[PDB]
Amino acid sequence: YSRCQLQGFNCVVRSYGLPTIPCCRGLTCRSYFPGSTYGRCQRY
């Protein structure tokens, strides 16, 4: 229970209120670029 996403997965830079579970500590979430609504997640 209480788990985080995986590495090399996708992310949501529009999830307002942080509704989607964010990657676990150590992983960051960036968008493919300014003007989109998606991105990826890696272990920093």
Side-chain angles (χ1 to χ4, degrees):
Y1 232 58
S2 195
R3 51 258 268 282
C4 306
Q5 283 255 99
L6 257 124
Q7 197 271 126
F9 257 62
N10 59 2
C11 216
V12 196
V13 294
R14 216 187 160 161
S15 232
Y16 301 134
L18 313 163
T20 298
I21 295 174
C23 301
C24 238
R25 172 167 270 95
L27 303 125
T28 20
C29 264
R30 22 176 238 132
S31 227
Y32 298 97
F33 242 35
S36 32
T37 319
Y38 231 63
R40 215 171 127 163
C41 190
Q42 265 137 63
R43 214 178 293 274
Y44 219 131

